[PDB]
Amino acid sequence: WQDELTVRGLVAALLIGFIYTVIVMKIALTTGLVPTLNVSAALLSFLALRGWTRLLERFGVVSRPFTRQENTIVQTCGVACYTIAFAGGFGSTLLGLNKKTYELAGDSPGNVPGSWKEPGIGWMTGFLLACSFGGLLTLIPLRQVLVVDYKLVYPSGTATAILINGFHTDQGDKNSRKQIRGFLKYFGGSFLWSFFQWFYTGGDACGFVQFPTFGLKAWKQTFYFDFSMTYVGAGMICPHIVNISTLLGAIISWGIMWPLISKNKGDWYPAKVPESSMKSLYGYKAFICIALIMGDGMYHFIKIVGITAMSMYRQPSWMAYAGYALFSVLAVVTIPVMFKQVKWYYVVIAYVVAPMLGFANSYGTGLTDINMGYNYGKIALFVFAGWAGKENGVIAGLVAGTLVKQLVLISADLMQDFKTSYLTQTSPKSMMIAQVVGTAMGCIVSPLTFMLFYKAFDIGNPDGTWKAPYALIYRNMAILGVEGFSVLPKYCIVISGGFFAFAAILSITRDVMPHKYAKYVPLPMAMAVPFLVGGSFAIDMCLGSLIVFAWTKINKKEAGFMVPAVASALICGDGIWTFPASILALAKIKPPICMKFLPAA
Amino acid sequence: WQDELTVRGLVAALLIGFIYTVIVMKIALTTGLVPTLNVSAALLSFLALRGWTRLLERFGVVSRPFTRQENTIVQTCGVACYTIAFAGGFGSTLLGLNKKTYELAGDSPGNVPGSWKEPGIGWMTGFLLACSFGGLLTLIPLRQVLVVDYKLVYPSGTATAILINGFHTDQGDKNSRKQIRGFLKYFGGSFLWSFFQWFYTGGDACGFVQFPTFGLKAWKQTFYFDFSMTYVGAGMICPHIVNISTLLGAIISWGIMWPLISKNKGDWYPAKVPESSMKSLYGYKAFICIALIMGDGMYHFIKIVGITAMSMYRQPSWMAYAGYALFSVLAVVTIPVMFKQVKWYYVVIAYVVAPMLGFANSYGTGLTDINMGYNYGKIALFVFAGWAGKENGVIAGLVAGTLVKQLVLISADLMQDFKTSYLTQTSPKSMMIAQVVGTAMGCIVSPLTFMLFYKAFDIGNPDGTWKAPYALIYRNMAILGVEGFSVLPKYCIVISGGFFAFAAILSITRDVMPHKYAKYVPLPMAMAVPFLVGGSFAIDMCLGSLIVFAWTKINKKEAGFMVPAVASALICGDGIWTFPASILALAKIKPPICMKFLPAA
Ligand SMILES: CC(C)CCC[C@@H](C)[C@H]1CC[C@H]2[C@@H]3CC=C4C[C@@H](OC(=O)CCC(=O)O)CC[C@]4(C)[C@H]3CC[C@]12C
Ligand SMILES: CC(C)CCC[C@@H](C)[C@H]1CC[C@H]2[C@@H]3CC=C4C[C@@H](OC(=O)CCC(=O)O)CC[C@]4(C)[C@H]3CC[C@]12C
Ligand SMILES: CC(C)CCC[C@@H](C)[C@H]1CC[C@H]2[C@@H]3CC=C4C[C@@H](OC(=O)CCC(=O)O)CC[C@]4(C)[C@H]3CC[C@]12C
Ligand SMILES: CC(C)CCC[C@@H](C)[C@H]1CC[C@H]2[C@@H]3CC=C4C[C@@H](OC(=O)CCC(=O)O)CC[C@]4(C)[C@H]3CC[C@]12C
Ligand SMILES: O=C(O)[C@H](CCN1CCC[C@H]1C(=O)O)NCC[C@H](O)C(=O)O
Ligand SMILES: O=C(O)[C@H](CCN1CCC[C@H]1C(=O)O)NCC[C@H](O)C(=O)O
Ligand SMILES: [Fe+3]
Ligand SMILES: [Fe+3]
């Protein structure tokens, strides 16, 4: 509980959060493709504190030793600081409320003239403070069930824990240096492989990432193999049933269902509207994907409640939810004050389903390491926009979309650190203090960082440097969302309801049979991840499982303790390169070559 | 001497030679890019004879065991049969004598109307028989000096010998199965890597072979890294001084000399004529390349003669040269009968320099595994065309170009098998019998195979399927060659003479210093190989030396006996795939995808 919270750690976390906020914010306001930087934060937290201790030792100043528990605290505090930068919708949703996006959207029903709000320090900071801490309190009951009871493996959380453990190991065990040397060989190889790939991804859909390994026809169906060691490494430490389910979901959606649905491009949905829109082939993608997750997610949530209810019938869990209710009512009486377009009971509905929605995202992140939190926000934005008419509907959808996205996204990304703390033997009490401190600085720094960018430069211009494409894209969903569920394509609800029931049946089927049949049951929400992303992620995960399957047969003993080290090195090596790659995009240094693939034209 | 020459081996070699002639001839008359198929012949010779013995055992017929010595005989006899198909200039030079190429070349000085000859069984077979056996007799004195005295490593000969040895090993030694399993792991990996590469080389200069590893600017200077395991594997078993010399030659020519010469595209040589022509930047490439080889080649040839002359002064070698003189005078009194355009003393000059020219090619092939025999023919074609005026000059250049090319190319490719026989403990006496028998069938089958293609189809049409581009290209060199050395670009002879002297000085310098300085002297004709081919071959060879250098430091003991096995597997794996790739081109099955690289346009 103590010896892990230090003043130097607070300074280090504050600095790491500040630069990582600037990197995230600048990328968000220029391209909207914010990268994952959690792994890089662990390395920077390690280097900064070891450098400070050595520099003081050089000057003769003695300092307390820097252990792995303190490294986890600094990394966790730093991550929470810059997570608010993109979880708060500064480049997607909150920027969609400005006047510039209102004019670009044009004149249409729902887009009434009173649907713009201007950014400011006073209201952005208060908006974040009220709602950011809501997700933190939900984590405490979720930490027990997911991290250790359900034994969910968080591949990025597990990889970071091994990386942090390898930094602070000092005693010469016989298996330790076999692991450390194995980690270092593949860490350098993966980092150099990612560095080599960068020079050839200099165009739209070209490079080693867009490699048509099984042909150009299968590549267009997203059934290729990108040379991503993050997904290959993640699949190595995931169970085979998770990897098989991921591929099985990609086959059903991209190999069968989407081609069959696309044959009705003129009947079921209009063909003039572009794809990736909620009226054309993306309503199928978004609603079927959540229905698979929600159908599986609800049953486990009811099962936990049902088990808990029976246990107390037979006879700090309520402390966290009491604080959550206190923060819930605080947002209920504050958010409508800032936005008169948002009614009081809109916030109430958002805060009741958030523990239930946050659980599903955390469970899904604990299976496939994919955070779908921003996908929940898109559905909630569409639904909440339909709960209001043309008047006060666009702002209501955007504001309520930020609420659902934050409590869902924050919960899943911050379960990554609890898995890291579990493996590094860090006290959960000290973790939550770093959770609150990191979130508190994030709710202060990010509004300040955004407005410095906002005042100095011009963000939102379609023809310019600081272009925020997702500010207008998120605005259009709310404009499309003011109309009810009628705008969804034909049979969209019927198919979604069928997949909701099908997901529930698998959850029923898995838990009712004996274990010697129950391990062949595919996981419904591991299936749902490739419904939105392509099947390349599924192929990469299965390749990682194939490597472990072959390795175990060849050498059972070595694969027992070397698979986690090799898999973590592959994840960390690609994760570390994400930091220099972001700096290159920060300085506008584009790749020189574009590796295109053509049909022998 | 016996137990290696068998009737079943003769039948197997005759069959393997016949199909390989058809594959070579069809590719020669359609694209002119004849591939290397020596490695594949060893595998097919092994499978055919093992299949025959097992099939007879299944039917109850008992047969003599099939040893590795018999496998070397069959492979050597088969190789000599189909080597004549492309060494005889059936698709480049002999096809340039037909009337179709004469009309396509147009009306120009030197291209007199009496400069066409039509193909036929009677004269093609007699032309080959007179001159093909000339190179065989020169091999006997060359076998002693090059294979074992000079200890030249023939990477394709060494790789084939290890492949043949691994086929016929039966006793469970402790290091044998470590070598066999190491060979098989990299043989399958290299073969599958070559198979994977094929689907993406579906265009002009696109694919993994044309990979700009160091940028597009360096790729245009041929300073990239093609993913060729043949050159990487060849460089592994070559000494470091050979690999370093190869890179050092590529730096001088492509990195320095060619860019400097190209700055005078309007002054030194005319700019209207295209490159790769003897009047524009290719006279520099061709004449400087030979001058480096000839300067080094002459000194070693004089050194052997000087050493031999001193030895006999102090006091079967002459049997081979007595037979060579007998075959030399036979061609002198026969070739001018077929071609009245060729004078008797043209053949005499060709047959005197052929042992001296053949030695240099065999020495160069024993260093870098690159056969430059067809490059000698281009120089001899140009020179002999200049020895005659506009009258009887084009045919004289073409016919004399075939003579010089055959005795030079045959000598170098057939020293590959003598290195194979040396490592497989095959009797040299039985090797020469397979040399003569294989050449005798080659001089019969190839004229017959060519005319069956010639009579049935239409070869030589620029707009058609059976197009022979090199038939017209070789015709144009003779047309350009009737004019003397004045057509060469400015300072072409001066620079060539400077490199001839510079090559000689290194040969002087290497043999005069003590050995503890003599190992740093670059080899002049290992430098000359990247003067015509790009520097990618140099980079691949140096990467192979880097792998061996790192492997030796990490584990001295294992790298001692596993480097030849791994290197041979890389060469054999790419060599084996050359057979199915040729069948795909035989059936006109083109690669589906073309992996292009663009400057981020
Ligand atoms: C033993 C293991 C390592 C096997 C290797 C994987 C194969 C199963 C893959 C690798 C390359 C793949 C091929 C790569 C490219 C194509 C081109 C594709 O043709 C196209 O449609 C390209 C575009 C066009 O031609 O219009 C058809 C599938 C095919 C043959 C793929 C079939 C499956 C292949 C052979
Ligand atoms: C074992 C691990 C490492 C993954 C290997 C998977 C591939 C070898 C196979 C398995 C699933 C196959 C896919 C299954 C389904 C389809 C759907 C099919 O889609 C269509 O029918 C086209 C629809 C249209 O016309 O739009 C094309 C082949 C493809 C992509 C197949 C291509 C090859 C895949 C990716
Ligand atoms: C530790 C080892 C493995 C180092 C890895 C090799 C590097 C030394 C190579 C690999 C990629 C190479 C780069 C690949 C591509 C380019 C693009 C090239 O720019 C171009 O001219 C492309 C065409 C254009 O932009 O017009 C400049 C060199 C550079 C940076 C190359 C510089 C050298 C690099 C970094
Ligand atoms: C260590 C082994 C594995 C090989 C690694 C070699 C590369 C790292 C280096 C060594 C030689 C270098 C080349 C040396 C000379 C040149 C010549 C230079 O040519 C020009 O000046 C351009 C002339 C023009 O404008 O036409 C461009 C850089 C280049 C290709 C360099 C690119 C990078 C190379 C290939
Ligand atoms: O939101 C989006 O769809 C895109 C890409 C998806 N986001 C990028 C990484 C995190 C993810 C997310 O949001 O969780 N981001 C728009 C700008 C910014 O990321 C934001 O959301 O404000
Ligand atoms: O000769 C050439 O320049 C080209 C490519 C080079 N030849 C192909 C492989 C062997 C090499 C050689 O000839 O030794 N071949 C033209 C047709 C045929 O190969 C022939 O030469 O009759
Ligand atoms: Fe986003
Ligand atoms: Fe040729």
Author numbering:
A (entry chain A), B (entry chain B): 45 to 359, 393 to 678
Copy the relevant paper text:
To overcome these limitations of DMA, proline 2’-deoxymugineic acid (PDMA), a DMA analog, was synthesized by replacing the four-membered azetidine ring with a five-membered ring. PDMA effectively substituted DMA for iron uptake by HvYS1 in the insect-cell assay system, and significantly improved the growth of rice in calcareous soil. In order to verify if PDMA functions in YS1 in the same manner as DMA, we determined the cryo-EM structure of HvYS1 in complex with Fe(III)–PDMA to an overall resolution of 2.9 Å. The HvYS1 structure bound to Fe(III)–PDMA reveals the outward open conformation, nearly identical to the apo and the Fe(III)–DMA bound structures. Fe(III)–PDMA occupies the same binding site as Fe(III)–DMA, demonstrating that PDMA can function as a potent fertilizer in an essentially identical manner to DMA. The carboxyl and amino group moieties of PDMA are recognized by YS1 in the same manner as those of DMA. The five-membered ring of PDMA is well fit with the binding pocket for the four-membered ring without any steric clashes. Our cryo-EM data supports that PDMA activity as a potent fertilizer uses the same mechanism as DMA.
Poaceae species use a unique chelation strategy, whereby plants secrete a high-affinity metal chelator, known as phytosiderophores (mugineic acids), and reabsorb the iron-phytosiderophore complex by the yellow stripe 1/yellow stripe 1-like (YS1/YSL) transporter for efficient uptake of iron from the soil. Here, we present three cryo-electron microscopy structures of barley YS1 (HvYS1) in the apo state, in complex with an iron-phytosiderophore complex, Fe(III)-deoxymugineic acid (Fe(III)–DMA), and in complex with the iron-bound synthetic DMA analog (Fe(III)–PDMA). The structures reveal a homodimeric assembly mediated through an anti-parallel β-sheet interaction with cholesterol hemisuccinate. HvYS1 comprises two distinct domains: a substrate-binding YS core and a scaffold domain, implicating an elevator-like transport.
